[PDB]
Amino acid sequence: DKTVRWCAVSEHEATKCQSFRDHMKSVIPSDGPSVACVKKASYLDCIRAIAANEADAVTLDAGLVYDAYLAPNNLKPVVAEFYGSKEDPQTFYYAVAVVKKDSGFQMNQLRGKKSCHTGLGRSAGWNIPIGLLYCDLPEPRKPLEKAVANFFSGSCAPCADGTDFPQLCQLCPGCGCSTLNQYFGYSGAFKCLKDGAGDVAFVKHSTIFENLANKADRDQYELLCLDNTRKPVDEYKDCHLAQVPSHTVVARSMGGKEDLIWELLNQAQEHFGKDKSKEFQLFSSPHGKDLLFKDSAHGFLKVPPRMDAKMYLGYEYVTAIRNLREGTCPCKPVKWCALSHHERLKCDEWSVNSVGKIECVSAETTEDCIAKIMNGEADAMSLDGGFVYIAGKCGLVPVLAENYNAGYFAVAVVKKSASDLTWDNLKGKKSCHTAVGRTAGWNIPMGLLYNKINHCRFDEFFSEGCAPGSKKDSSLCKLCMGSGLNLCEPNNKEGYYGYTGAFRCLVEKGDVAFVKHQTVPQNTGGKNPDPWAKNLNEKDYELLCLDGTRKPVEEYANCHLARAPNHAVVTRKDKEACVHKILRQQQHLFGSNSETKDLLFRDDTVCLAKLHDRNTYEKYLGEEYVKAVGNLRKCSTSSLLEACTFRRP
């Protein structure tokens, strides 16, 4: 058997699950998955049951998704309910802080204001705002209501203990926890702001649109962003307190059975989903409310496999609820993340030389590092421009740029003896790329190529090549050099990976190499002692210009594909100022006055440059870079980018 043991927290849910199980037997063959129904007393008991391998799946609210993640449960979200349109699936809501336009305060100025909450104990209206504000609350913070009552000068916190903490009901006397209170619920908390009772309303992103029809009235309101900035109310995706998943199915991190659960649920919706009008409806409960799933759901989406719980809830949500659960308050040391075995050792030397200012965490992949920076396990790392795009679309920001002397020049290099080649026709040639999705060796060359050919299936534009990161069966892996499972992989164990590796690929197999303007000079004329490069002469290679002509290697300024953005340090926005200081101070002490090659920082970097103007990824990379990368995503799967595109399309 291959059965999904579904968990029920009530006797009505168990009856739903049993009807579920029986109706599935009629639409799924013997080859497919079955339902079994485990009934426990509570969602926590279900979580412990799934972790103890006594059940397989349950669907939880976000707060319980957090509890399911913690040790020793270690559950992960696998399937998400969506709501509204099939064309526009709404999987998350946004907790926001609405304010009146031109009221003159930011998130870090909330103390002493007047607040409107949807209700004590609710997510958007209490748990998230108070969780994020927890360390700003006066001491003692137990009980929590007393601390909030001594933070906001007066509030409307429905369901709060107004007898003991009357400040919490100054704007709705009695703190009535019923719609009899005009300022209760999601509309009421907003009305508390509209009517002028309060200064800020902690609500969901859609309340403002549900209670104000005209946009003219909606331009009188703004949102507080966590960076102490405001934005308009329809920019909640860039100015919220937390992005919360509505209702998501969790499963064991190892031991699945994610594959089975999705197959079961996906076929369940195709047969008993919304508007299928069978005798059994998946999202209906003839007796009860929201049994197994929210009755308002319209279907299920499969959660991308890269996604863990901290990443799916988001950094701000996890921060807020962790503050509520544990209640621990203190630039700190900067946790730099490293990759290879050789790269972590350089960081250790840096850490002891920094005297505590720098610490070191490590991962196996750049994407694993990027993930650790999102959820707080790490703070900063230096990234290729293509990874800055990934990191930016995951909410990270560039802080400093590595300067090598505006940016460097991306070039296309050919062997001069082949005077046949020209930029105007490389169809059916042999290409050598640094890796897939990188600035010099992919995003700039293949971005330009997309405009002439109108697709990103470069496997059938070139004859063959080596572009590490491609699928191992691809023609763009046939010229690669790594052996075993190292063939075509984007790491050091593939000899044609990187700036120099791509050049070596041109020297030994390829017709054209896409690199940076320093590559060919750095590896010719005996400068590179390796046997493959020791006897090469820079004069034997030329650059392909956009003209259609060719020019010598040293004349890259007038024979360049484009100007490339240099590698940059990325971190999350709440650490931008701190990394900006500690690093620029470490740079003034260990700067322009690695053992292997290109460890932690590129080895041709003079200093880490101030940014100011270009402090976001679209501003740093540029309009045409992000536009080109947008086309190239149609043919390239970065599983980390797939997870971040699930939260922020």
User: In this structure, what token pair is assigned to residue 519?
Assistant: 């590559």
556 is an annotated ligand-binding site residue: no
Is residue 151 within 8 A of residue 134, CB to CB? The reply is no
Q: Is the dihedral of CA 404, 405, 406, 412 positive or negative?
A: negative
Q: How many residues does the chain have?
A: 649
Task: Please report how close the Cβ of residue 295 comes to ligand NTA at its closest, in angstroms.
Answer: 13
- Which residue, 359 or 384, has its beta carbon nearer to Ti ion? 384
Alpha-carbon distance 15 to 22, whole Å?
11
- Which residue, 147 or 411, has its beta carbon nearer to Os ion? 411
- Which residue, 13 or 222, has its beta carbon nearer to ligand NTA? 13
Is residue 440 within 8 A of residue 548, CB to CB? The reply is no
Task: Please report how close the Cβ of residue 478 comes to Os ion at its closest, in angstroms.
Answer: 15
- Which residue, 142 or 341, has its beta carbon nearer to Os ion? 341
Q: Compute and round to an integer the Cα radius of gyration of the chain.
A: 28
Residue 56, contacted partner among Os ion, ligand NTA, Ti ion, none, CB below 5-8 A by kind: none
Is residue 75 within 8 A of residue 251, CB to CB? The reply is yes
| DSSP code string of 503-571 | HHHHHHT-SEEEEETTHHHHTSTTSS-STTTTT--GGGEEEE-TTS-EEESS-GGGS-SEEEPPPEEEE
What is the total count of residues that contact ligand NTA (CB under 6 A)?
Answer: 2
199 is an annotated ligand-binding site residue: no
560 is an annotated ligand-binding site residue: no
Place of tokens 């449960």: 73
Nearest CA among 192, 186, 190, 200 for reference residue 169:
192
Task: Please report how close the Cβ of residue 551 comes to Ti ion at its closest, in angstroms.
Answer: 22
Is residue 231 within 8 A of residue 223, CB to CB? The reply is yes
455 is an annotated ligand-binding site residue: no
- Which residue, 200 or 435, has its beta carbon nearer to Ti ion? 435
- Which residue, 12 or 509, has its beta carbon nearer to ligand NTA? 12
Name which of residues 262 to 301 contact Os ion (CB under 5 A).
none
Is residue 646 within 8 A of residue 440, CB to CB? The reply is no
23 is an annotated ligand-binding site residue: no
Among 32, 121, 166, 288, binds ligand NTA (CB under 6 A): 288
Residue 525, contacted partner among Os ion, Ti ion, ligand NTA, none, CB below 5-8 A by kind: none
Alpha-carbon distance 310 to 74, whole Å?
11
Name which of residues 310 to 349 contact Os ion (CB under 5 A).
341
- Which residue, 196 or 286, has its beta carbon nearer to ligand NTA? 286
- Which residue, 12 or 322, has its beta carbon nearer to ligand NTA? 12
Residue 15, contacted partner among ligand NTA, Os ion, Ti ion, none, CB below 5-8 A by kind: none
Number of Cβ atoms within 10 Å of the Cβ of 287: 8
Residue 606: CA atoms inside 13 Å, Cβ hemisphere, count?
Answer: 7
Pairing state between β 512-516 and 430-433: parallel
- Which residue, 384 or 459, has its beta carbon nearer to Ti ion? 384
Task: Please report how close the Cβ of residue 15 comes to ligand NTA at its closest, in angstroms.
Answer: 10
- Which residue, 14 or 334, has its beta carbon nearer to ligand NTA? 14
Residue 384, contacted partner among ligand NTA, Ti ion, Os ion, none, CB below 5-8 A by kind: Ti ion
Task: Please report how close the Cβ of residue 298 comes to ligand NTA at its closest, in angstroms.
Answer: 23
Number of Cβ atoms within 10 Å of the Cβ of 439: 28
154 is an annotated ligand-binding site residue: no
- Which residue, 87 or 623, has its beta carbon nearer to Os ion? 623
Residue 439, contacted partner among Os ion, ligand NTA, Ti ion, none, CB below 5-8 A by kind: Ti ion
Task: Please report how close the Cβ of residue 492 comes to Os ion at its closest, in angstroms.
Answer: 9
441 is an annotated ligand-binding site residue: yes
Task: Please report how close the Cβ of residue 46 comes to ligand NTA at its closest, in angstroms.
Answer: 18
Q: Which residues contact 568 (CB under 8 A, 6 or more apart)?
A: 382, 383, 385, 388, 398, 399, 400, 401, 402, 611, 620
Name which of residues 3 to 32 contact ligand NTA (CB under 6 A).
12
| DSSP code string of 67-105 | HHHSTTT-EEEEEEEEEE-SSSEE-EEEEEEEEETT---
Task: Please report how close the Cβ of residue 118 comes to ligand NTA at its closest, in angstroms.
Answer: 25
268 is an annotated ligand-binding site residue: no
125 is an annotated ligand-binding site residue: yes
Crossing angle of the two packed helices 315-326 and 62-69, in degrees rounded to 10: 70
> If you ran DSSP here, which 8-state letter would residue 230 be given?
E
157 is an annotated ligand-binding site residue: no
- Which residue, 156 or 599, has its beta carbon nearer to Os ion? 599
- Which residue, 19 or 443, has its beta carbon nearer to ligand NTA? 19
| DSSP code string of 466-497 | E-TTS-TTSGGGTT----GGGTT-SSTTSTT-
Alpha-carbon distance 355 to 585, whole Å?
13
Task: Please report how close the Cβ of residue 250 comes to ligand NTA at its closest, in angstroms.
Answer: 25
124 is an annotated ligand-binding site residue: yes
Alpha-carbon distance 362 to 366, whole Å?
10
Residue 457, contacted partner among Ti ion, ligand NTA, Os ion, none, CB below 5-8 A by kind: none
Place of tokens 């919706």: 269
434 is an annotated ligand-binding site residue: yes
- Residue least distant from Os ion (Cβ): 341
186 is an annotated ligand-binding site residue: yes
Task: Please report how close the Cβ of residue 39 comes to Os ion at its closest, in angstroms.
Answer: 14
Q: What angle do CA 611, 612, 616 make, to 5 degrees?
A: 80
Nearest CA among 511, 496, 562, 500 for reference residue 541:
511
Residue 231, contacted partner among Ti ion, ligand NTA, Os ion, none, CB below 5-8 A by kind: none
Is residue 37 within 8 A of residue 18, CB to CB? The reply is yes
Binding site for Ti ion (CB under 5 A): 384, 439-440
295 binds ligand NTA (CB under 6 A): no
Task: Please report how close the Cβ of residue 388 comes to Ti ion at its closest, in angstroms.
Answer: 10
Pairing state between β 568-571 and 229-232: unpaired
Helix (H/G/I), strand (E/B), else coil: 288: coil
- Residue least distant from Ti ion (Cβ): 439
Alpha-carbon distance 189 to 95, whole Å?
13
205 is an annotated ligand-binding site residue: no
12 is an annotated ligand-binding site residue: no
Residue 552, contacted partner among Ti ion, Os ion, ligand NTA, none, CB below 5-8 A by kind: none
118 is an annotated ligand-binding site residue: yes
Task: Please report how close the Cβ of residue 369 comes to Os ion at its closest, in angstroms.
Answer: 18
Task: Please report how close the Cβ of residue 16 comes to ligand NTA at its closest, in angstroms.
Answer: 11
Mark the binding-site residues for Fe(3+), compressed into ranges: 61, 93, 186, 247, 384, 408, 499, 567
Provide the binding-site residues for Os ion, judged by CB under 5 A.
341
Mark the binding-site residues, compressed into ranges: 61, 93, 118, 122, 124-125, 186, 247, 384, 408, 434, 438, 440-441, 499, 567
Mark the binding-site residues for hydrogencarbonate, compressed into ranges: 118, 122, 124-125, 434, 438, 440-441
Provide the binding-site residues for ligand NTA, judged by CB under 6 A.
12, 288
